[PDB]
Amino acid sequence: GKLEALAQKLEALAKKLEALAWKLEALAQG
Amino acid sequence: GKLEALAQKLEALAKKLEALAWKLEALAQG
Amino acid sequence: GKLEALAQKLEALAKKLEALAWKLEALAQG
Amino acid sequence: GKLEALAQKLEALAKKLEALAWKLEALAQG
Numbered sequence: 001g002k003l004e005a006l007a008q009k010l011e012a013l014a015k016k017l018e019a020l021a022w023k024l025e026a027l028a029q030g
Numbered sequence: 031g032k033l034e035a036l037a038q039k040l041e042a043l044a045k046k047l048e049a050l051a052w053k054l055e056a057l058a059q060g
Numbered sequence: 061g062k063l064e065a066l067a068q069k070l071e072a073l074a075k076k077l078e079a080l081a082w083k084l085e086a087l088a089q090g
Numbered sequence: 091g092k093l094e095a096l097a098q099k100l101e102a103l104a105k106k107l108e109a110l111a112w113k114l115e116a117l118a119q120g
Contacts, residue, residue, distance in 0.1 A: 003093075006084055007054035010100070013076055014047035017107070020069055021040035024114070027062060028033035032117055033063075036110060040070070043107055047077070050100055054084070057092060063118035070111035077104035081097045088093035 001058060002087060003054060003058035003084075006080055006087070007051050007058055009080055010047060010054060010077075011051040013073055013080070014044050014051060017040060017044040017047065017070075017073055020066060020073070021037045021044060024033060024037040024040065024063075024066055027066075028031065028037060033114075036114055036117070039110055040107075043103055043110070046103055047100070050096060050103070054096060057096075061118070063114060067111050067114035067118060070107060070114060074104045074107040074111060077100060077107065081100040081104060084093055084097035084100065088091070088097060
């Protein structure tokens with residue numbers, strides 16, 4: 001249903017944010 | 031330093047988003 | 061512009077989250 | 091009800107992410 005589609009999109013964006021945070025950590029360390 | 035602190039704040043937000051995704055998915059499955 | 065590029069990606073992600081919140085609220089009101 | 095409460099939590103998280111994106115851009119420019 002529409003709710004499941006939205007939840008899946010939220011999880012995907014959360015994972016993208018984790019990947020960006022990792023990149024920031026990598027840049028911060030050097 | 032400041033970038034690492036920012037990355038940790040981003041990770042904290044991403045964790046809260048994922049928690050919301052599990053909650054929305056449970057509502058969808060219920 | 062490595063940090064500026066990441067900041068732009070973070071802003072875009074936030075706007076996608078805001079669109080999802082709007083869609084969830086629209087589903088709630090339906 | 092619940093969906094609206096969850097949507098508001100998501101909107102609040104998105105706004106916090108925007109503040110973090112702003113802070114990253116500010117750090118990058120100075």
